[PDB]
Paper text:
[name], or [name], is a type-one transmembrane protein from the complement regulatory protein family. When responding to complement activation, [name] binds the complement activation fragments C3b and C4b, which have been deposited on the host cell. [name] then facilitates the cleavage and inactivation of these complement activation fragments by acting as a cofactor for serine protease factor 1. Bovine [name] acts as a cellular receptor for bovine viral diarrhoea virus (BVDV), a bovine pestivirus causing reproductive losses, as well as other clinical signs, such as diarrhoea and mucosal disease in persistently infected animals.
The STP region which is situated between the [name] and the transmembrane domain was not present in these protein constructs. The putative BVDV binding site was located in SCR1 and encompassed two peptides, E66-V69 and G82-L87. When mapped to the structure, these peptides were found on the C and D beta strands and D’D loop and formed a single binding site due to the antiparallel beta strand configuration. The area of interaction with BVDV was identified as two peptides on SCR1, as seen in both bovCD46 structures; these form a single interaction interface. Comparing this region with the same region in the human structure revealed a shift in the DD’ loop. An intriguing feature of these two crystal structures was the crystallographic dimer formation, which was identical in both protein constructs, despite them varying in size, unit cell, and space group. Our attempts to verify that this crystallographic dimer was physiological were not conclusive.
Author numbering:
A (entry chain A), B (entry chain B): 41 to 169
């Protein structure tokens, strides 16, 4: 009879398109989601439909990427409102009294190319008034 | 003779309605599309039919707005399937085993007001079974 629905993972997704049923011996190859990277590069991540008609056990193979850390602009400050620079986080820029924020005040950690995250915007500056 | 077809832009559209033909000296003012915002606010964006009957050079002036970042619901997870919270992306909500999803499982980053994007739905929760 075989294996039906593959489990959903935190950090991975099926590499290709899933079919309705799987028979013993067939495998689904997984790959990191957007914004995640391999825990151990080169490691092949796969589920196998087994003879006892179960899905085999697959350890989570990927981890959330991080954007580069960010310095305070001169005469102002960057706030890691989400507690980190992990993918899917944002940062808030503010300026000190007497200064005016020139540029973007919120920046987002996003996928830049297939491999890599980056901040959506450059840092602003704090200009004197 | 004059200038005929103004180029269509990635991030901008003409502010008003276009006429069949333009003469040298006339200008078409551009504005951000729905779901975009100025790259450098204040900067006036316009094409001008020049005297050499060409359209002037206009850099792309706007950039895709972003929706606010999203936290994983307790006992579950939000998946930025498109790699960002940019206008016109979606996120998927999933719950851990033992938990069911109470609410909407897909949220879309949409235009909310003239200036503004927001998610189409509030986050669901994950409740025990
Ligand atoms: C954001 O990511 C979502 C999820 O991956 C994208 O939507 C998905 O788009 C794929 C195509 O890339 C759709 O696949 C299609 O499946 C149908 C049958 O399901 C098939 O007839 C087609 O030939 C095609 O293979 C998929 O259904 C769709 N999934 C969902 C949940 O909407 C979306 O395109 C991405 N958005 C942006 C802005 O990049
Ligand atoms: C289905 O068969 C597989 C064997 O291919 C079982 O996996 C093994 O299970 C034992 C006991 O749980 C472990 O000590 C081994 O390390 C497992 N091997 C592998 C490769 O995973 C699996 O438990 C079986 N499942 C059911 C429901 O019968
Ligand atoms: C990162 O932190 C921001 C700021 O606290 C979170 O965005 C706020 O979320 C609250 C609800 O928790 C909303 O009421 C606000 O509208 C959001 N603020 C802004 C400026 O949009 C965001 O959810 C957090 N992101 C992650 C990934 O945890
Ligand atoms: C047209 O004239 C402008 C100067 O107003 C010049 O910058 C542009 O390169 C010219 N282009 C052509 C095709 O003649
Ligand atoms: Cl810091
Ligand atoms: Cl996240």
């Amino acid at each position: 009879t075989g294996c039906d629905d593959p489990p959903r993972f935190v950090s991975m997704k099926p590499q290709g398109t899933l079919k309705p049923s799987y028979s013993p011996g067939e495998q689904i190859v997984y790959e990191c989601r957007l914004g995640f990277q391999p825990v151990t590069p080169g490691q092949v991540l796969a589920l196998v439909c087994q003879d006892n008609n179960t899905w085999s056990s697959l350890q989570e193979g990927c981890k959330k990427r991080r954007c580069p850390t960010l310095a305070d602009p001169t005469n102002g400050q960057v706030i890691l409102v989400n507690g980190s620079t992990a993918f899917g986080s944002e940062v808030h820029y503010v300026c000190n009294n007497g200064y005016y924020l020139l540029g973007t005040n919120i920046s987002y950690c996003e996928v830049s190319s297939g491999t890599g995250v980056n901040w959506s915007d450059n840092p602003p500056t704090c200009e004197k008034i």
